[PDB]
Nucleic acid binder design. Structure first.
Lengths: 244, 102, 59, 67, 88, 49
DNA sequence: GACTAGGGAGTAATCCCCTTGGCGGTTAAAACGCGGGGGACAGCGCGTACGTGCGTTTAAGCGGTGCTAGAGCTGTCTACGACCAATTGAGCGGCCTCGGCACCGGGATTCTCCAGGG
DNA sequence: CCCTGGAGAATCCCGGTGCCGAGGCCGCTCAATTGGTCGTAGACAGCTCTAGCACCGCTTAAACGCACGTACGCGCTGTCCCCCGCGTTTTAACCGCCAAGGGGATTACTCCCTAGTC
């Protein structure tokens, strides 16, 4: 890596550098120096939260043009969208007085936000579209300047379709024993007093048992006899030898 | 003040209160209770000058703890005075045996 | 003793520091001229045809 | 930290160590060890030897009467 | 709590007007000053117990065997000059 | 092996002295300042804490 | 004298930020193994520098002496230090910078190895 | 026999940008000065007394030279064994992912505490 940074400061050494998400933070000291004309974030959803050091190590990065590519902005909250807008937008510029911030993570809660995940998560009544259309239209208008999405409707002349199929699998006898034991133990522990604390491990190991079944704790073993080893011959060997 | 009238700068009264609390004697010597502060001031001036010189040697404006380390360790008299006490984040003078070299 | 052993050490090490500062200045100017020579020997004015020539060779 | 906890749990539980304390003993032990090692280096360069063996370490430990 | 940072700072400033300090070095100096003070002060206490009785001669003599003589004569001389300055 | 023995003979002794000191201080916790007392009585004092 | 009106506390619902565990991904430090070579050490020879026996003297202990100047205790006083608080300023508790420190790159400079001939 | 041109590679060093904290600035703040007392402990002789300075003549006990002599620290020889530099692998912390409580604040309903006049 150092040998590849040998001609790093040469003005005409290279034009494009490809770097992983786990190496920008590792070598942010050596990356924050060079002036980058363009920066692109592939799979932009890899950064979605405002708590990670991944976003912070790139917020103050010295670049003027930023582009984020993602398959689809998704998950439960729009905080991911707000963080993405901040990352493309960032107000913190060397001048520091233009105050060109998009909108605060809390200031975006008034502008749609809480109504969006309120109505959307209650999509049964979302067909009313009396006040829901207001927030949806506001989000569409506010995202139109920076958005570009095209589904498979643009290319359909030669496109094989997707056929979703769900396969149901039964439960084996000993794995059923394992599942019942674990699930009854978890329901007796979590619902009342317990040890230190344990509530997500129940679901996780239940998932493990449903997924794999007869492993992750024990296998069918290679049966062999017990090896009781004290014996009694050596106790009386001395007495016998003395006698004869 | 008392230090100003004495030409000193260390707070003498704080040391007087410390010695009164320590009760090393019922009636401490009040003829010159800042004298024990004066000798410490002289020693502090010595060590501060040596530390400042050491920091100036390696082009660093601020007193590096290592700079103070070599400042105290270089002086044989200082080593005799304080040699059984270590310093946090200190160091060791580069001492390579001549006969060790190939 | 002599009230000047520490002061003599001061004098020696401050002469050393003055020599170090002189070395600092001369190395500053020598790398300034090094950078000047590098700029003169560096590539200038890629323009269009030359940049496309280097681009097609790299291609 | 693992070694400190292992050697300290043999006395009392809920010790609640403060990381500054373990840093202090860490600095103390490294300083003592480097002093020891330079002393045994001197004790070895005494003899026509440049490789350190238990004899020098034992001699250095016994000479100062640590225990 | 009364820290001693101001006094050491001004001593450094009157002996080096452009040299800074580090936070670790501040604690280093504070501990050095404190433990030297305690060491010489208990030495003075044992020197008071030395004489079959309950000043400045005790402290001068105590600094006279605790630290190397070369700096010890300067210490006692400057202490005496300080008490002469403070006398009137 | 011998260096590991030096740790096993050096760390634990100052650990015992430190814990009995902080017990003598009636403090149900250990602070960095408690190590300094042990270092002072062991003949190897450390500055900075 | 009977009942009326309004607002902060009592009761309560919302939010929502804050973390407990587990698990996967990925880099760095630790862990393990080989060719070969330089460090450890035996075997030995010797010389010369002490290990030792005996003559021939200066010197500490011996044996005692005649005192002589410094050390311990007896009054005695008096200069001074440990006893309240008003103070009021020397200095610390909390915050806000821009600068020296952190640290890496291009280059000059320098430190080291070899297979040959010189 | 042994010296080195070339090459590989570590060093010294100053640009050269980002960061966080050392030092300055602000707001209390509590402890050293200072008036006095009053009585405590050490300086100032003073009488005393007690060990040492130098002196004398002995007494062989140590001290030193001389000669033998002899064996050990050191330096020569050789081998051998074992630890390092480098190449390949595996624990080892660290940071992201998720769905659920805990709780702390935060605000809404309301309900009693408060207080006015026909």
């Amino acid at each position: 890596r150092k040998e590849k940074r040998k001609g790093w400061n040469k003005p005409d050494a290279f034009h494009v550098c490809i770097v992983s998400y786990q190496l920008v933070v590792q070598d942010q000291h050596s990356f924050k120096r060079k002036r980058w004309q363009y920066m692109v974030l592939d799979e932009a959803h890899n950064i979605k939260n405002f708590r990670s050091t991944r976003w912070q190590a790139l917020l103050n990065f010295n670049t003027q043009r930023r582009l984020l590519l993602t398959g689809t902005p998704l998950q439960n909250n729009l905080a991911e969208l707000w963080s993405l807008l901040y990352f493309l937008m960032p107000q913190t510029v060397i001048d520091g007085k233009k105050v060109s911030g998009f909108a605060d993570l809390d200031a975006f809660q008034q502008w749609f936000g809480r109504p969006v995940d309120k109505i959307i998560e209650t999509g049964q009544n979302f067909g009313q579209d009396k006040e829901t259309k207001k927030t949806v239209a506001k989000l569409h208008q506010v995202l139109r300047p920076y958005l570009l999405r095209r589904l498979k409707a643009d290319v359909e002349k030669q496109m094989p379709a997707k056929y979703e199929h769900i396969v149901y699998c039964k439960l084996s006898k000993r794995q059923r024993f394992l599942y019942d034991d674990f699930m009854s133990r978890a329901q007796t522990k979590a619902t009342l007093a317990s040890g230190n604390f344990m509530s997500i491990v129940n679901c996780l190991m239940q998932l493990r048992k449903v997924c794999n079944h007869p492993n992750l704790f024990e296998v069918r073993p290679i049966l062999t006899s017990f090896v009781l080893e004290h014996c009694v011959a050596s106790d009386y060997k001395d007495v016998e030898r003395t006698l004869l | 003040s008392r230090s100003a009238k004495a030409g000193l700068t260390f707070p003498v009264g704080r040391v007087h209160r410390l010695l009164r609390r320590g009760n090393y004697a019922q009636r401490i010597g009040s003829g010159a209770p800042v004298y024990l502060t004066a000798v410490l001031e002289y020693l502090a001036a010595e060590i501060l000058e040596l530390a400042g010189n050491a920091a100036r040697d390696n082009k660093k404006t601020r007193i590096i703890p290592r700079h103070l380390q070599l400042a105290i360790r270089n002086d044989d008299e200082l080593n005799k005075l304080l040699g059984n006490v270590t310093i946090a984040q200190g160091g060791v003078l580069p001492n390579i045996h001549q006969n060790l070299l190939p | 003793r002599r009230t000047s052993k520490r002061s003599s050490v001061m004098e020696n090490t401050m002469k050393v520091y003055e020599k170090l500062s002189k070395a600092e200045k001369k190395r500053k100017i020598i790398q300034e001229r090094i950078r000047k020579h590098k700029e003169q020997e560096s590539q200038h004015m890629l323009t269009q045809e030359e940049r496309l020539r280097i681009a097609k060779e790299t291609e | 930290q693992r070694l400190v906890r292992e050697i300290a749990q043999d006395f009392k539980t809920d010790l609640r160590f403060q990381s500054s304390a373990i840093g202090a003993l860490q600095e103390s032990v490294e300083a003592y060890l480097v002093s020891l090692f330079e002393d045994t280096n001197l004790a070895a360069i005494h003899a026509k030897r440049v490789t350190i063996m238990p004899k020098e370490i034992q001699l250095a430990r016994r000479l100062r009467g640590e225990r | 709590k009364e820290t001693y940072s101001s006094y050491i700072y001004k001593v450094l400033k009157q002996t080096h007007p452009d040299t800074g300090i580090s936070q670790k070095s501040m604690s280093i100096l504070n501990s050095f000053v404190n433990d030297i003070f305690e060491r010489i002060a208990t030495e003075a206490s044992k020197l008071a117990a030395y004489n079959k009785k309950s000043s400045a001669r005790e402290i001068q003599t105590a600094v006279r065997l605790i630290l190397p003589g070369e700096l010890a004569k300067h210490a006692v001389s400057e202490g005496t000059r300080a008490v002469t300055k403070y006398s009137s | 092996e011998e260096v590991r023995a030096v740790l096993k003979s050096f760390l634990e002794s100052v650990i015992r002295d430190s814990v009995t000191y902080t017990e003598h201080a009636k403090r149900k916790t250990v602070t960095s300042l408690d190590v300094v007392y042990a270092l002072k009585r062991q003949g190897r004092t450390l500055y900075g804490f």
